[PDB]
UniProtKB/Swiss-Prot annotation, chain A:
Highest expression is found in the olfactory lobe, piriform cortex, dentate gyrus, hippocampus, granular cell layer of the cerebellum, and in caudate-putamen. Belongs to the glutamate-gated ion channel (TC 1.A.10.1) family. GRIK2 subfamily. The gene is Grik2. This is Glutamate receptor ionotropic, kainate 2. The postsynaptic actions of Glu are mediated by a variety of receptors that are named according to their selective agonists. This receptor binds domoate > kainate > quisqualate > glutamate. It does not bind AMPA without coexpression with GRIK5. Sumoylation mediates kainate receptor-mediated endocytosis and regulates synaptic transmission. Sumoylation is enhanced by PIAS3 and desumoylated by SENP1. Residues 118-252 are extracellular. Homotetramer and heterotetramer with GRIK5. Tetramers may be formed by the dimerization of dimers. Assembles into a kainate-gated homomeric channel that does not bind AMPA. Can form functional heteromeric receptors with GRIK4 and GRIK5. Can form functional heteromeric receptors with GRIK3. Interacts with DLG4. Interacts with NETO2. Interacts (via C-terminus) with KLHL17 (via kelch repeats); the interaction targets GRIK2 for degradation via ubiquitin-proteasome pathway. Ionotropic glutamate receptor that functions as a cation-permeable ligand-gated ion channel, gated by L-glutamate and the glutamatergic agonist kainic acid. L-glutamate acts as an excitatory neurotransmitter at many synapses in the central nervous system. Binding of the excitatory neurotransmitter L-glutamate induces a conformation change, leading to the opening of the cation channel, and thereby converts the chemical signal to an electrical impulse. The receptor then desensitizes rapidly and enters a transient inactive state, characterized by the presence of bound agonist. The chain holds residues 430 to 805 of 908 of the full protein. It comes from Rattus norvegicus (Rat). Disulfide bonds join C201-C251.
UniProtKB/Swiss-Prot annotation, chain B:
Changing N204Q: Loss of glycosylation. Belongs to the glutamate-gated ion channel (TC 1.A.10.1) family. GRIK2 subfamily. It is found in: Cell membrane; Postsynaptic cell membrane. The gene is Grik2. This is Glutamate receptor ionotropic, kainate 2. Highest expression is found in the olfactory lobe, piriform cortex, dentate gyrus, hippocampus, granular cell layer of the cerebellum, and in caudate-putamen. Glycans are attached at N3, N204. Sumoylation mediates kainate receptor-mediated endocytosis and regulates synaptic transmission. Sumoylation is enhanced by PIAS3 and desumoylated by SENP1. Ubiquitinated. Ubiquitination regulates the GRIK2 levels at the synapse by leading kainate receptor degradation through proteasome. The chain holds residues 429 to 804 of 908 of the full protein. Disulfide bonds join C203-C253. L-glutamate binds at P89, A91, R96, A142, T143, E191. The lineage of its organism: Eukaryota, Metazoa, Chordata, Craniata, Vertebrata. Ionotropic glutamate receptor that functions as a cation-permeable ligand-gated ion channel, gated by L-glutamate and the glutamatergic agonist kainic acid. L-glutamate acts as an excitatory neurotransmitter at many synapses in the central nervous system. Binding of the excitatory neurotransmitter L-glutamate induces a conformation change, leading to the opening of the cation channel, and thereby converts the chemical signal to an electrical impulse. The receptor then desensitizes rapidly and enters a transient inactive state, characterized by the presence of bound agonist.
């Protein structure tokens, strides 16, 4: 049968290029939690696949003026991919235009910052400007802030939007670097914070979770794969396999 | 000329669904309160439906009979189109999703252990390796089914014990499980969000260990229902607004 086209994005420890002196080709180039997940799905559901990194390097948001989506979300809308297997947040605005499986991981927005400071919450950031803060451009965190009517978060969006050329970044890795090299706090998904703080012992999560959401496999709206992938994820969960995969891929 | 009211099946479970305390007799939907009742009210305004709440006739969440293959509980009510929706702390599971549809989750949780304070018991593994302290779960719910189906060594040993002693250790409700913890040397396998509620109100009890699994509660619908995806959208919008968190804080030593 026809191999499914799978869009994804580089994001440690979900999807990475394998380290090797030997040049690698095709799907063999990739590893990570989401690649392990994809492999399990392919075996359970009986399909073959071809991984392609999303050409624009984006997760996906809707343009304010022209209404067009970008990123992995747009690839699915345009039927240029069959699945998006990535740390792709299931959100209200995305679910209106693409389908998602049920979640394979649950998480929420939180804050990455340096240790040792009196900053303890988003409210602490919102009331000041000396410590800058931001998020990945055209992802779910940015979109949460952009849409929020909660006073702390709407204040924070006004600031991010004002300073966007400096404080919105293209990737989580660029956000981490901004935290390490300037006085900056990064609004980041909590499962990623967990990974980063285990490896950067001067960094910490600030406060708790600001929201709650899950990562799901994306499909074009109406795809028959969406419900099949939900069943496969539920079966993996029941067996403990997703927890094992998390432990596989995830200070003094 | 109005649309038919949806029949919503549910089950008594504090603080999700309860009868209101009142000296005045109450009728119809006005009898009920709780997190799931507030959720249902929000869904009905978002989606534009009216409804009638009915407690599941057989008092069960739902499991499949291994001899005759029939389901029971709220799951069976949906299969048979005796209800339009199930709005309850109904776990989304692989075996249920094969026969009914669920919305995406409105709450995430996992199985853990409820026991009395003051003990060296620290995990399911510690319980499994002994028999002096009995343990069990709600009959014909998701926790029981997780154990019955598990191939993990600790949990399959637990199921063998629970099954052997089921007339004594499987119970009809979380409340009966709590009373067993309080009146005998018994540990109850219970969902974590319910443990959180119970231990905040009885300071003699505690959670033992962490979460054994991960799952969500979802609104159940019959397979193929058009309400499933609409309710998923309404849930995602409520979460994006922070309203589910506010509802949890309202209802929850
Ligand atoms: N995982 C996010 C990107 C990272 C973020 O927004 O914090 C998404 O699905 O858009
Ligand atoms: N909420 C569970 C019942 C309680 C339990 O099994 O622990 C269900 O959906 O079956
Ligand atoms: Cl009617
Ligand atoms: Cl779904
Ligand atoms: Na990237
Ligand atoms: Na959708
Ligand atoms: Na289903």
């Amino acid at each position: 049968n026809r191999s499914l086209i799978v869009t994804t994005i580089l994001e440690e420890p979900y999807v990475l290029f394998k380290k090797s002196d030997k040049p690698l080709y095709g799907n063999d180039r990739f590893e990570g939690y989401c690649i392990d997940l994809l492999r399990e799905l392919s075996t359970i559901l009986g399909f073959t696949y071809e991984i392609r990194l999303v050409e624009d390097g984006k997760y996906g948001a809707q343009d304010d003026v022209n209404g067009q989506w970008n990123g992995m979300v747009r690839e699915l809308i345009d039927h240029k991919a069959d699945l998006a297997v990535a740390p792709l947040a299931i959100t209200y605005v995305r679910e209106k235009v693409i389908d998602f499986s049920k979640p394979f991981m649950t998480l929420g927005i939180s804050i990455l910052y340096r240790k040792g400071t009196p900053i303890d919450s988003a409210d602490d950031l919102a009331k000041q400007t000396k410590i800058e803060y931001g998020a990945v451009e055209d992802g779910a965190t940015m979109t949460f802030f952009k849409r929020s009517k909660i006073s702390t978060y709407d204040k924070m969006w006004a600031f991010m939007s004002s300073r966007r050329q400096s404080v919105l970044v293209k990737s989580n890795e660029e956000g981490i670097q901004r935290v390490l090299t300037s006085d900056y706090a990064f609004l980041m998904e909590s499962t990623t914070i967990e990974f980063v703080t285990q490896r950067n012992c001067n960094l910490t999560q600030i406060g708790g979770l600001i929201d709650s959401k899950g990562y799901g496999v994306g499909t074009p709206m109406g795809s028959p794969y969406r419900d099949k992938i939900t069943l496969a994820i539920l079966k993996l969960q029941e067996e403990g396999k997703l927890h094992m995969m998390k432990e596989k891929w995830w200070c003094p």
